């Protein structure tokens, strides 16, 4: 017997967070981040060691 309701791939919207304000200081940046809900920030260096 067929089990109905297959997982179809479907396009669906997700929120866009507040655009960060970046202040630049020598060898570094500072992001002023406002997010009402929890928001994932992921940073990595583009060298040999990606911290």
């Amino acid at each position: 017997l067929h089990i109905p309701f297959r997982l179809t791939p479907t396009v669906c919207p997700v929120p866009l967070a507040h655009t960060p304000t970046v202040t630049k200081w020598f060898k570094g940046i500072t992001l002023h981040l406002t997010a009402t809900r929890p928001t994932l920030l992921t940073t990595r260096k583009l060298g040999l060691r990606a911290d």
Partner: protein
Amino acid sequence: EATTHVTATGSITLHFSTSSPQANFIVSLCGKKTTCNAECKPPADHIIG
């Protein structure tokens, strides 16, 4: 710019990017070599895109 247009008795402007405090390098215009030599200042912008 790689290829320029040279007519007669004129001047052409070009842009370069360097990593040295001194610009002391050889420019070959169409066969002839010249030594461009002066000082470069550190940037005021700390972070670039």
